[PDB]
Design a protein around this motif. Structure first.
Motif, PDB file in Angstrom:
ATOM      1  N   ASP A 171       0.842  -1.179   0.000  1.00  0.00           N
ATOM      2  CA  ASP A 171       0.000   0.000   0.000  1.00  0.00           C
ATOM      3  C   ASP A 171       0.884   1.237   0.000  1.00  0.00           C
ATOM      4  O   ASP A 171       2.113   1.132  -0.104  1.00  0.00           O
ATOM      5  CB  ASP A 171      -1.036  -0.022   1.140  1.00  0.00           C
ATOM      6  N   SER A 172       0.255   2.401   0.126  1.00  0.00           N
ATOM      7  CA  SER A 172       0.953   3.676   0.094  1.00  0.00           C
ATOM      8  C   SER A 172       1.983   3.807   1.217  1.00  0.00           C
ATOM      9  O   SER A 172       2.901   4.629   1.131  1.00  0.00           O
ATOM     10  CB  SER A 172      -0.062   4.819   0.157  1.00  0.00           C
ATOM     11  N   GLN A 173       1.823   2.991   2.264  1.00  0.00           N
ATOM     12  CA  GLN A 173       2.728   2.974   3.416  1.00  0.00           C
ATOM     13  C   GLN A 173       3.679   1.775   3.427  1.00  0.00           C
ATOM     14  O   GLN A 173       4.332   1.503   4.435  1.00  0.00           O
ATOM     15  CB  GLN A 173       1.940   3.015   4.734  1.00  0.00           C
ATOM     16  N   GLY A 174       3.754   1.063   2.309  1.00  0.00           N
ATOM     17  CA  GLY A 174       4.665  -0.075   2.197  1.00  0.00           C
ATOM     18  C   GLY A 174       4.174  -1.346   2.873  1.00  0.00           C
ATOM     19  O   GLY A 174       4.943  -2.298   3.030  1.00  0.00           O
ATOM     20  N   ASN A 175       2.897  -1.377   3.252  1.00  0.00           N
ATOM     21  CA  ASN A 175       2.321  -2.570   3.874  1.00  0.00           C
ATOM     22  C   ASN A 175       1.827  -3.568   2.851  1.00  0.00           C
ATOM     23  O   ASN A 175       1.021  -3.242   1.982  1.00  0.00           O
ATOM     24  CB  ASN A 175       1.185  -2.196   4.821  1.00  0.00           C
ATOM     25  N   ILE A 218       9.650  -8.603   4.173  1.00  0.00           N
ATOM     26  CA  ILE A 218       9.328  -7.322   3.541  1.00  0.00           C
ATOM     27  C   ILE A 218       8.979  -6.298   4.616  1.00  0.00           C
ATOM     28  O   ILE A 218       8.114  -6.536   5.475  1.00  0.00           O
ATOM     29  CB  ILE A 218       8.197  -7.411   2.481  1.00  0.00           C
ATOM     30  N   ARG A 219       9.683  -5.171   4.570  1.00  0.00           N
ATOM     31  CA  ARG A 219       9.524  -4.107   5.551  1.00  0.00           C
ATOM     32  C   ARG A 219       8.697  -2.991   4.951  1.00  0.00           C
ATOM     33  O   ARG A 219       8.881  -2.630   3.775  1.00  0.00           O
ATOM     34  CB  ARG A 219      10.892  -3.565   5.981  1.00  0.00           C
ATOM     35  N   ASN A 220       7.772  -2.455   5.745  1.00  0.00           N
ATOM     36  CA  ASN A 220       7.007  -1.291   5.309  1.00  0.00           C
ATOM     37  C   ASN A 220       7.857  -0.025   5.423  1.00  0.00           C
ATOM     38  O   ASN A 220       9.044  -0.100   5.775  1.00  0.00           O
ATOM     39  CB  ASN A 220       5.669  -1.162   6.061  1.00  0.00           C
ATOM     40  N   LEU A 221       7.256   1.126   5.141  1.00  0.00           N
ATOM     41  CA  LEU A 221       8.007   2.389   5.103  1.00  0.00           C
ATOM     42  C   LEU A 221       8.493   2.840   6.485  1.00  0.00           C
ATOM     43  O   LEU A 221       9.376   3.700   6.597  1.00  0.00           O
ATOM     44  CB  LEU A 221       7.198   3.484   4.393  1.00  0.00           C
ATOM     45  N   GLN A 222       7.928   2.237   7.529  1.00  0.00           N
ATOM     46  CA  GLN A 222       8.403   2.410   8.893  1.00  0.00           C
ATOM     47  C   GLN A 222       9.419   1.329   9.283  1.00  0.00           C
ATOM     48  O   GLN A 222       9.736   1.155  10.460  1.00  0.00           O
ATOM     49  CB  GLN A 222       7.227   2.439   9.871  1.00  0.00           C
ATOM     50  N   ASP A 223       9.921   0.604   8.281  1.00  0.00           N
ATOM     51  CA  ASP A 223      10.987  -0.388   8.452  1.00  0.00           C
ATOM     52  C   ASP A 223      10.563  -1.620   9.257  1.00  0.00           C
ATOM     53  O   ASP A 223      11.398  -2.327   9.824  1.00  0.00           O
ATOM     54  CB  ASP A 223      12.233   0.272   9.076  1.00  0.00           C
ATOM     55  N   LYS A 228       7.351  -7.611  13.298  1.00  0.00           N
ATOM     56  CA  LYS A 228       7.708  -6.435  14.092  1.00  0.00           C
ATOM     57  C   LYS A 228       6.544  -5.457  14.189  1.00  0.00           C
ATOM     58  O   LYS A 228       6.366  -4.809  15.224  1.00  0.00           O
ATOM     59  CB  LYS A 228       8.944  -5.733  13.526  1.00  0.00           C
ATOM     60  N   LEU A 229       5.762  -5.352  13.112  1.00  0.00           N
ATOM     61  CA  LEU A 229       4.527  -4.580  13.153  1.00  0.00           C
ATOM     62  C   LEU A 229       3.567  -5.171  14.179  1.00  0.00           C
ATOM     63  O   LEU A 229       2.976  -4.411  14.964  1.00  0.00           O
ATOM     64  CB  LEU A 229       3.855  -4.537  11.776  1.00  0.00           C
ATOM     65  N   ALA A 230       3.425  -6.488  14.204  1.00  0.00           N
ATOM     66  CA  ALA A 230       2.541  -7.141  15.153  1.00  0.00           C
ATOM     67  C   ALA A 230       2.943  -6.776  16.575  1.00  0.00           C
ATOM     68  O   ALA A 230       2.116  -6.512  17.430  1.00  0.00           O
ATOM     69  CB  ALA A 230       2.584  -8.631  14.972  1.00  0.00           C
TER      70      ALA A 230
END
Length: 247
Positions: A171-175, A218-223, A228-230
């Motif tokens: 998505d727009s945020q790398g998710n 795969i890392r989102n835009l917040q790395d 790690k998001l979880a």
């Protein structure tokens, strides 16, 4: 007699009666108009007649959808109706494909995809973003299908002959869809099985469709990876999944 203004058009697709579209091709031809023209779209959002038709499925069916797509194709529209997106800040990017998936109509999804609908279009308006209330599913059609627990639609999106959706899309945020599943997960016993079921299904799909790619890395835009998001978002149940999965 055949003149269609937006009201006639929109009313003629809302009831699902394709005979109410009689005269439309001839009128569009005569006037060199297209169904994506500003006069035929909602001024506030850019909502099209196709979106209206898909929003008005009854029992998965609106007989006006294919005729609209055929009319648009015959008109030779340089900007295909199928891929029109909302233009306002709130619903930006919303497309007929997103609506079809939300309606849980695999048949409509197939019709749209067959007619060129852009499986990587992002519903990225404020309504669709984190972070008061929002309708978040990670913006993408595949991610929507996964987050709404539609394996049949996920399967079709991934494997169809027209435009296969990529597991690697963000998505727009790398998710990715995996990040999206983390985000929509909760810590309730009653909900986790369905989430971890699509999660695992997608990992299995990754092994088939992008075997060299470690989707969980795969890392989102917040790395942040999905794991790690979880952790960050307090998604304990999926965090535990995701760790213990390979056992």
């Amino acid at each position: 007699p055949n003149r269609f203004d937006r009201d006639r058009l929109f009313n003629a697709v809302s009831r699902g009666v394709p005979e109410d579209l009689a005269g439309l091709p001839e009128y569009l031809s005569k006037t060199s108009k297209y169904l994506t023209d500003s006069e035929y779209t909602e001024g506030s959002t850019g909502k099209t007649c196709l979106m209206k038709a898909v929003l008005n499925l009854k029992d998965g069916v609106n007989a006006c959808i294919l005729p609209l797509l055929q009319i648009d194709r015959d008109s030779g529209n340089p900007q295909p109706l199928v891929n029109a997106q909302c233009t306002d800040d709130y619903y930006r990017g919303h497309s007929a494909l997103h609506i079809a998936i939300e309606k849980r109509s695999l048949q409509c999804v197939k019709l749209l995809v067959e007619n060129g609908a852009n499986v990587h279009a992002r519903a990225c308006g404020r309504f669709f973003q984190k972070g008061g209330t929002c309708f978040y599913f990670g913006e993408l059609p595949l991610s929507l299908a996964a987050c709404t627990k539609q394996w049949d639609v996920v399967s079709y999106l991934l494997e169809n002959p027209h435009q296969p959706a990529s597991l690697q899309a963000t998505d727009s945020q790398g998710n990715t869809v995996l990040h999206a599943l983390v985000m929509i997960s909760d810590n309730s016993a009653e909900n986790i099985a369905l989430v971890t079921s699509m999660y695992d299904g997608l990992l299995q799909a990754g092994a088939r469709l992008c075997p060299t790619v470690q989707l969980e890395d795969i890392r989102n835009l917040q790395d942040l990876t999905p794991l790690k998001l979880a952790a960050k978002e307090g998604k304990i149940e999926i965090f535990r999944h995701i760790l213990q999965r390979e056992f």
